[PDB]
């Protein structure tokens, strides 16, 4: 695609953004 590369490293990985509250909650 157009730019594939993108999604596959922002949809794919930037998209990890819902577990980042409880994966991170340790820190304050």
């Not at 730019?3 to 820190?27: D, E, I, Q, S």
């Amino acid at each position: 695609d157009i730019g594939m590369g993108v999604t596959y490293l922002a949809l794919l990985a930037a998209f990890k953004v819902r577990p980042t509250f409880a994966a991170g909650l340790l820190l304050r």
